[PDB]
Design a protein around this ligand. Sequence first.
Ligand SMILES: Cc1cc2nc3c(=O)[nH]c(=O)nc-3n(C[C@H](O)[C@H](O)[C@H](O)COP(=O)(O)OP(=O)(O)OC[C@H]3O[C@@H](n4cnc5c(N)ncnc54)[C@H](O)[C@@H]3O)c2cc1C
Ligand SMILES: Cc1cc2nc3c(=O)[nH]c(=O)nc-3n(C[C@H](O)[C@H](O)[C@H](O)COP(=O)(O)OP(=O)(O)OC[C@H]3O[C@@H](n4cnc5c(N)ncnc54)[C@H](O)[C@@H]3O)c2cc1C
Ligand SMILES: Cc1cc2nc3c(=O)[nH]c(=O)nc-3n(C[C@H](O)[C@H](O)[C@H](O)COP(=O)(O)OP(=O)(O)OC[C@H]3O[C@@H](n4cnc5c(N)ncnc54)[C@H](O)[C@@H]3O)c2cc1C
Ligand SMILES: Cc1cc2nc3c(=O)[nH]c(=O)nc-3n(C[C@H](O)[C@H](O)[C@H](O)COP(=O)(O)OP(=O)(O)OC[C@H]3O[C@@H](n4cnc5c(N)ncnc54)[C@H](O)[C@@H]3O)c2cc1C
Ligand SMILES: CCCCCCCCCCCCO[C@@H]1O[C@H](CO)[C@@H](O[C@H]2O[C@H](CO)[C@@H](O)[C@H](O)[C@H]2O)[C@H](O)[C@H]1O
Ligand SMILES: CCCCCCCCCCCCO[C@@H]1O[C@H](CO)[C@@H](O[C@H]2O[C@H](CO)[C@@H](O)[C@H](O)[C@H]2O)[C@H](O)[C@H]1O
Ligand SMILES: CCCCCCCCCCCCO[C@@H]1O[C@H](CO)[C@@H](O[C@H]2O[C@H](CO)[C@@H](O)[C@H](O)[C@H]2O)[C@H](O)[C@H]1O
Ligand SMILES: CCCCCCCCCCCCO[C@@H]1O[C@H](CO)[C@@H](O[C@H]2O[C@H](CO)[C@@H](O)[C@H](O)[C@H]2O)[C@H](O)[C@H]1O
Lengths: 403, 404, 408, 395
Amino acid sequence: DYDLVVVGGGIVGAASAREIVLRHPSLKVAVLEKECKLAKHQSGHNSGVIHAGIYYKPGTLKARLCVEGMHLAYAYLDEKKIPYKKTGKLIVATDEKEVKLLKDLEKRGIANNVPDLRMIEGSEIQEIEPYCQGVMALHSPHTGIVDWGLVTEHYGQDFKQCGGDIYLDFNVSKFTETYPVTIHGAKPGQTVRTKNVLTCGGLQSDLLAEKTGCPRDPRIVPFRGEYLLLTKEKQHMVKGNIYPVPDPRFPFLGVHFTPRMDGSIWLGPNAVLALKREGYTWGDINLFELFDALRYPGFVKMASKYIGFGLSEMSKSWFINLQIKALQKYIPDITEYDIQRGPAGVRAQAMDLDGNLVDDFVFDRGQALAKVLHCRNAPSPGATSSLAIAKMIADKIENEFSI
Amino acid sequence: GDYDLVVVGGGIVGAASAREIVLRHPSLKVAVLEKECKLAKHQSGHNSGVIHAGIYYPGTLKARLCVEGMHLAYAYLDEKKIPYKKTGKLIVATDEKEVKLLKLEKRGIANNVPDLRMISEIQEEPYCQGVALHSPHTGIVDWGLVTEHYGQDFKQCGGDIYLDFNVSKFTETDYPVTIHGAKPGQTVRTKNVLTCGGLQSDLLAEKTGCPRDPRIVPFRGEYLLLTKEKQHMVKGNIYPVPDPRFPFLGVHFTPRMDGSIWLGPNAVLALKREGYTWGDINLFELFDALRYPGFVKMASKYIGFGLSEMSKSWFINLQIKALQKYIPDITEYDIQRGPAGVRAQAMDLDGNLVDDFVFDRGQGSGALAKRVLHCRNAPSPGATSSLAIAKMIADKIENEFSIG
Amino acid sequence: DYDLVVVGGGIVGAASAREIVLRHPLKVAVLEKECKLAKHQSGHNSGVIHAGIYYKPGTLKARLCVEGMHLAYAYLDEKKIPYKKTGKLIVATDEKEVKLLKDLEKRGIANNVPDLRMIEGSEIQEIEPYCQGVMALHSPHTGIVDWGLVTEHYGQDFKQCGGDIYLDFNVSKFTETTDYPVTIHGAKPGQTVRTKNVLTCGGLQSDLLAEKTGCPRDPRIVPFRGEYLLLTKEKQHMVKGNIYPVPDPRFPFLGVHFTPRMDGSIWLGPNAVLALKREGYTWGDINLFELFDALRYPGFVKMASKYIGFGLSEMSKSWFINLQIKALQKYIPDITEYDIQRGPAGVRAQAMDLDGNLVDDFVFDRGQGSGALAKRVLHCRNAPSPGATSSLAIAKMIADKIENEFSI
Amino acid sequence: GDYDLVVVGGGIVGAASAREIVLRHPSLKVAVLEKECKLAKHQSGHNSGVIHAGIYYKPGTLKARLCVEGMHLAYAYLDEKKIPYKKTGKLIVATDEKEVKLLKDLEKRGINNVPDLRMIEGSEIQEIEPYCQGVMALHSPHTGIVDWGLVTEHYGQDFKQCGDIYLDFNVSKFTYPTIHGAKPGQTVRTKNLTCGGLQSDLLAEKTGCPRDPRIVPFRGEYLLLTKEKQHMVKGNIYPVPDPRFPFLGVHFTPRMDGSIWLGPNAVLALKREGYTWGDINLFELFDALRYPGFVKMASKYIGFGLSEMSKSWFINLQIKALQKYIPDITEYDIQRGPAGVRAQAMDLDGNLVDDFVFDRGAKRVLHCRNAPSPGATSSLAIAKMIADKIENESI
Ligand SMILES: Cc1cc2nc3c(=O)[nH]c(=O)nc-3n(C[C@H](O)[C@H](O)[C@H](O)COP(=O)(O)OP(=O)(O)OC[C@H]3O[C@@H](n4cnc5c(N)ncnc54)[C@H](O)[C@@H]3O)c2cc1C
Ligand SMILES: Cc1cc2nc3c(=O)[nH]c(=O)nc-3n(C[C@H](O)[C@H](O)[C@H](O)COP(=O)(O)OP(=O)(O)OC[C@H]3O[C@@H](n4cnc5c(N)ncnc54)[C@H](O)[C@@H]3O)c2cc1C
Ligand SMILES: Cc1cc2nc3c(=O)[nH]c(=O)nc-3n(C[C@H](O)[C@H](O)[C@H](O)COP(=O)(O)OP(=O)(O)OC[C@H]3O[C@@H](n4cnc5c(N)ncnc54)[C@H](O)[C@@H]3O)c2cc1C
Ligand SMILES: Cc1cc2nc3c(=O)[nH]c(=O)nc-3n(C[C@H](O)[C@H](O)[C@H](O)COP(=O)(O)OP(=O)(O)OC[C@H]3O[C@@H](n4cnc5c(N)ncnc54)[C@H](O)[C@@H]3O)c2cc1C
Ligand SMILES: CCCCCCCCCCCCO[C@@H]1O[C@H](CO)[C@@H](O[C@H]2O[C@H](CO)[C@@H](O)[C@H](O)[C@H]2O)[C@H](O)[C@H]1O
Ligand SMILES: CCCCCCCCCCCCO[C@@H]1O[C@H](CO)[C@@H](O[C@H]2O[C@H](CO)[C@@H](O)[C@H](O)[C@H]2O)[C@H](O)[C@H]1O
Ligand SMILES: CCCCCCCCCCCCO[C@@H]1O[C@H](CO)[C@@H](O[C@H]2O[C@H](CO)[C@@H](O)[C@H](O)[C@H]2O)[C@H](O)[C@H]1O
Ligand SMILES: CCCCCCCCCCCCO[C@@H]1O[C@H](CO)[C@@H](O[C@H]2O[C@H](CO)[C@@H](O)[C@H](O)[C@H]2O)[C@H](O)[C@H]1O
């Protein structure tokens, strides 16, 4: 019924299916999503920041796609008239040990050609954020905030305006050979036949790849990202984004202060090991989803080296008074009575056999069903670089299937 | 939009109640809010699918609603032209004590289950044995499809079904109550509210002012699928003689409209409200069910019964020794594990399992109170008695909400 | 240093050591890890002296019981050890239990149990006026005793003939050095004992000690806690003797029985609950090393495949004692939950093969090869039930087994 | 009726008090009731055997008063009875400039009338420990190595030679107005204290004392350095610990037999006598976790306690911290050794008790629920304080 279908209604799958039919309008492209609407998981529960590209090492792939995607996104928001607020980004250092890291993020950010990056001292910190302390800060006024869930839906809008079809409530559960390939949903009779596919399963990147002939690695390890909602009384204390100086050994950016479109400013997210693939709450646990997460060889290797950082993140979440004490190192005007537990997101972090966290493209196919391409990982961050990542995925697909 | 009445629940009880209230009053502006993407996505979409004739329940309301609902169901199935098969039920006894309990025959004759005969005798079910009761008016149907037709009739009467509407907060506003969904900006204004939340009967009732009791204790009903190489060994429904102390009818043989033979369901306590799998655990929803005062009181009396259900689930080989008492030519190789349903069992603070109607509301004569009525439980079988209990739910809200 | 070492100060190890020194007046020592002898199974038992009623006629388990019973009474009177000889009344609950009790009557008189006599009706009131039932089986020769006190007398006779008892000696390792090739190391540093041959009756650790020589993991020791209930002193007059239920013949467990102790107390038990620890006498005692290994045993998965229902039954009645009372009221109905109290417990050293069966026979095992430790250290990994009553008979069997394995 | 005074607990505290009591009044009928077979089978038998100089303790405090006095009393007792010991330096070593500040406060608090407190510079470090690095350090040569289990046996040896140690006596309930044991018939009546280490809270509840202060077991795990490199550690090597906790941190310490133990750490034991990780007790966890003060301390000190468990789960991380002192140790050079359990008392607000705590019901009983640290070196000094409190409550 179709030529190629994209499995995944996330911002990556929507932007890829959009980009491929814009350049090739003669291709019947469909999209299968297991949920009611688009961007229900990662791209629907994010902090909503358009990143400038500072943390990523120059000359790498992630440093190029982020800077290119940040300009492609801003140009896309004006064409579609999507609301967005360009607020300041302050990477504030609190002691003499973090400014050395801040000085590395300084030279690393300038090499990526981020627009108008300045390094302010403690005197000018209140000039951008009057309520924030710090020894030194890094100001990136080009960063902005946007609802990536609305951005994801606008991708699907332009997708089917060119002839696409978005099949929502379609839980892909099996691939069969009959248009040679055939896709089967969770409901009986719900089936779609095509020639090739391209999956962007996000949190189920590996499980979709296990139903074609790909190995278990790289396994998707769920990391919950919890947020705290500051009360409306003190929303004026944060004008823009206030980021901390993170540990460069991990891709996590740490809990930060971030405003949103609805005037709400949120505190987060953290790095909490989710005991469930879609474990948005701490109580929700799946025994089968962690027996494999524990029997995975790479998990024991990462835990052998980085168990202390994951447990202290879980410590600051068990007792939020510890998290407040950390946030007071930046804005000491916030107490435990000025916040309340909000929603959270889960990160689909890839992991190899050695325990490293993957931050690179991971395409895989079977060893008819083989030669079905699975995008098991995309470079961070997937939201800002979405349009740039889409073009790169729109190049891998045309050589794997000859379009 | 603004409405007169709002029904929270896309199940067979919420849809039939919403369908009944608009047929009696076509001038009403009634809406339906369902948190899932389709009607009958839980209990009404994960059931055995057999239409009961009320042979186990006389003089009460459940025995009247089931037989009346069974007659109204066959009339609705023929009017809307929905496929159904009169498979017939065969309640077989095995031991000598089960013969005394089956002599269930007197209660079924009083309830006027038509063509009820005490049978064992012969295999005129060929492969079934044992030392029985036949009622050929018991049939099977897709109750999930029946629920969709209730929504089709409700939409044809001017009603709107809001899907993906996860009700999360009732606040005060001509339409003095407003309803908040999960997504920001999802708002519906109404005058009076009726909730049929099924597995979330108590949680929805808590957002108005109702007490914790009765609590909804999840009981997962796992099913085993007899493979196609032996589906011919069961022609109609073959039920065992159950313990009258529990509403669970025990693991039974039941054919489906697609020709498959399903074996079940059992009674395994789910570690989650929507725990359809054995491993899915919600520590919050688990601790509250156990810390509920009525749970330990019920566990102190019948935990051995629930443990044998779990043991037959952990080791399937123990389950077939029971099934071999009815059909001995079934091995461990002829069956596979299938899907499951979770029962919204209501339980009081004393431990007794609720089986009657439970309507609850607020207290202090406010706006959220008196205008939001919660159906915390409906008599079983809910699917078969759906058209029957919908008439009594419509009568309840007509009195409670004053409708013309 | 010594010619023979018997590790384990239980009733089986002390009887074998006492027997082996009387026949060969040999430098033999006894190593016990605990403070005193009979600190486990020999000191945490029902204290009943059985006659061969339940056991198969003509088998070794049935011969040893009546042989050890007659040897015990002769030994109790010889050493002036206090013992009370009441009766064991096995009552049937329903007609289905009358069929099993009829077989136990024929199975008991075949092994010469003096003197079996079936009773029924109002005759049950003549022996126990508070207990009911359809039919019963009377055994006037069944008595009670302090098996822990009996075990200490075995070591008393063992020391009265030149034997040395090593207390607080936790055997940790078996190494080789001659003339005494095998030395035995303890938990404390420097504590060592050299010997020519070693015999191990470790009870709950018979498989762990055998693993330190070269013996396989099977048969594994699976701990089964046996909890007791204390009948209040206000109703201890309601039971005059031993009231036993007819047990399932598939399991060696005799079932929760009414049993008086010689201090006047009436204990109701024991049950058969799986222990989360080899020496887990309480409900909360959990050792993850011993828990996560009893589950990884191949026989444990096979045994639970067929008898998990009987085990969860025992556990459910252990969590809610009201269920246990409803079972005991089928015999003496005037007992309620207010008339009981949680008491101490014992742990059975139940051996299990790889197929899941509970072995109840003699299991001797030595190391592999012609080395020093493999040919001089013999492990008794299981003894026939009951080890306490059959102690004198088991000791003679073990003594003959040692006389052949080591040529003394 | 048999004895006049009964000391429940045969640890180093119970043995020293019973020994001190009979020397003052040789006419008293005194007995010691120990649950285990030998004396010093628990806390006193499972320690680093260090005679503490007393450098961490604030001046003018009671803990600093008994430590400096008990250390001198212990050195006189070891020579009087000819007990083997070795006087090696402790050498408090620092790392970064942030650790030098706390090391400077340790030198000021010590100069508590500590003897011969010299501050090593850096090049002189190799003259005391040639394999240890660091920036600055604080030396004190009169610290000692000792078998505290051997000393406890000598305390009871004198007590038994001055007029009875009842071993295997698990004191159960209470009834010369009777002390019951675990075995039926095991009895002994007295006219007048308990010093149970990990059970001072449970013994007090047998006569009507409140649950507070509770005893929270903290397992102290040790690591045995390989015998092939048992020469890199000549004396003690202690890190600069966080002053908010009584734990001195994992340290290098040699034993009488030449072995060197690395530790102990502070890992929450899941059992009162939980000497290994897998040994847990559910009843003793609903005790500690449901305790009101435990949640208060956990809400403030969970991060430090979680990293301790992380270093215990993976020695991978533990040696990475030890290499900051001597960097010539690998993973194959270490091996998991034995451990001890700390009888840390905790009040209802979460604070860790560090002073004397005596509580009675009902009048003839007196439970020393806690004693100042370190109880091993302060054994003779603390015993003098316990003997003064029991004489007043009218010997
Ligand atoms: C807490 C959090 C905060 C973040 N904040 C930011 C930020 O501030 N800025 C930024 O640039 N990035 C941010 N990100 C990253 C960004 O959200 C993700 O990188 C991006 O959404 C990845 O796109 P995706 O489509 O792969 O994710 P997803 O949206 O999760 O894509 C997966 C989709 O596939 C569907 N699916 C899965 N399995 C199947 C199946 N079998 N059949 C059919 N459909 C299936 C899922 O339902 C889902 O819709 C954040 C991520 C997290 C977790
Ligand atoms: C395993 C099993 C087998 C059964 N077999 C039979 C049989 O053979 N024959 C028979 O007659 N009966 C049978 N039944 C009974 C029958 O299925 C139920 O009685 C019936 O489905 C009850 O109707 P309901 O509306 O409560 O269903 P439900 O679907 O459970 O109704 C609850 C609905 O409300 C929605 N909801 C909950 N909370 C919210 C919220 N906050 N906001 C919005 N929506 C919300 C849920 O998504 C759901 O759609 C069976 C039941 C079970 C569990
Ligand atoms: C609850 C219960 C009730 C019973 N009731 C009865 C009854 O009524 N009548 C009856 O006849 N029988 C009864 N028995 C059975 C009888 O008690 C046992 O069969 C018998 O006690 C076991 O003898 P043993 O010598 O093997 O025992 P144990 O006493 O268990 O012997 C093991 C000994 O080995 C020692 N040991 C272990 N490892 C080492 C080591 N490394 N170094 C040194 N020493 C070590 C232990 O300390 C211990 O003392 C009962 C058993 C139980 C559990
Ligand atoms: C890991 C660790 C390392 C240490 N290192 C050092 C060090 O280097 N230097 C230093 O000076 N100090 C050190 N200490 C401190 C010192 O070892 C202890 O503080 C000291 O032993 C406490 O004395 P105690 O008698 O109360 O202890 P314990 O020896 O525990 O005394 C309690 C005794 O009473 C018995 N008992 C308990 N309940 C009962 C009962 N009901 N009936 C009968 N008997 C009972 C117990 O069996 C035990 O023998 C260390 C402590 C620990 C835990
Ligand atoms: C499964 C077990 C293994 C777990 C896997 C490994 C997980 C690793 C997660 C690393 C921690 C998350 O990322 C971490 O966030 C914290 C908290 O914001 C940052 O912390 C930083 O900012 C916070 C406030 O925001 C300051 O109080 C803090 O002093 C500073 O270090 C770290 O710089 C960053 O490294
Ligand atoms: C607090 C939580 C603890 C659990 C609470 C109590 C839960 C009670 C569970 C009841 C068990 C389910 O319901 C029970 O099903 C079993 C097994 O199908 C039926 O059992 C019947 O049919 C089976 C075959 O299916 C026959 O082998 C059996 O001999 C017969 O009794 C029981 O008659 C019925 O009572
Ligand atoms: C870990 C997985 C495996 C679990 C282990 C399974 C072990 C098997 C358990 C056997 C149970 C103990 O042994 C069992 O005791 C019970 C209770 O006393 C006896 O039961 C008998 O007496 C009791 C009262 O005492 C009566 O209420 C009962 O009707 C009668 O049958 C059984 O006849 C006997 O079989
Ligand atoms: C129950 C949950 C809460 C747990 C309760 C609170 C437990 C508190 C324990 C704190 C940790 C133990 O004590 C802590 O030991 C560590 C490790 O040795 C010391 O750490 C010090 O020495 C180590 C080496 O040993 C160095 O690598 C480290 O850089 C240095 O800081 C800390 O200075 C001390 O504070």
